[PDB]
């Protein structure tokens, strides 16, 4: 009808012995694959950054920097530690209608260079999910590309459901 079924959590590995204070900091969104498709309006999706800030209570203050309409956009929220280290939930979700509970899981990371992070939504029977490719820089090697594509496909996503955003020199640096 619109989307690919969200794969079981078994299909989604977790970074063994996840290290809080080393995943902290800025990650560029250099790749994105999701079951929800796009508008393809204009055609290129701009690159954006996400700053993970570790707090005392082990939650992350998550600030995302984007650029659109001659404006720098800032999206601030909290990632609450989930059942296993490397897993997060989205809390404080109330008020504005749409009880969307998010599931966050760190699959793999260098801490120093790359990370791949799984995202799952639960809201009204049909579930939206995406995998995000993070890098400490904006560079994208064919090796990292191919790695990500194959990981996407193993979760049931087609080639055309995978996006590699064009790098920008505005807001995100």
């Amino acid at each position: 009808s619109d989307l690919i079924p969200a794969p079981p959590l078994s299909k989604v590995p977790l970074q063994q012995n996840f290290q809080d204070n080393q995943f902290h900091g800025k990650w560029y969104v250099v790749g994105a694959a999701g079951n929800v498709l796009l508008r393809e309006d204009k055609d290129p999706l701009k690159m954006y950054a996400t700053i993970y800030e570790l707090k005392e209570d082990k939650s992350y203050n998550v600030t995302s920097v984007g650029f659109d309409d001659k404006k720098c956009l800032y999206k601030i929220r909290t990632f609450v530690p989930g059942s296993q280290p490397g897993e997060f939930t989205l809390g404080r979700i109330k008020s504005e209608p749409g009880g969307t509970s998010w599931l966050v899981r760190v699959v793999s990371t260098n801490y120093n260079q790359h990370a791949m992070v799984f995202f799952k939504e639960v809201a009204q029977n049909r579930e939206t999910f995406n995998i995000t490719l993070y890098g400490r820089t904006k560079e994208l090697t064919s090796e990292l590309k191919e790695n990500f594509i194959r990981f996407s496909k193993s979760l049931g996503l087609p080639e055309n459901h995978i996006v590699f955003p064009v790098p920008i020199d505005q807001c995100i640096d």
Binding site: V29, L38, K46, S64, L73, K75, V104, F119, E121
Partner: peptide, 11 residues
């Protein structure tokens, strides 16, 4: 969308 990945849509 500008924040097309991660916890999409929120707020």
């Amino acid at each position: 969308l500008v924040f097309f990945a991660e916890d999409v849509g929120s707020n």
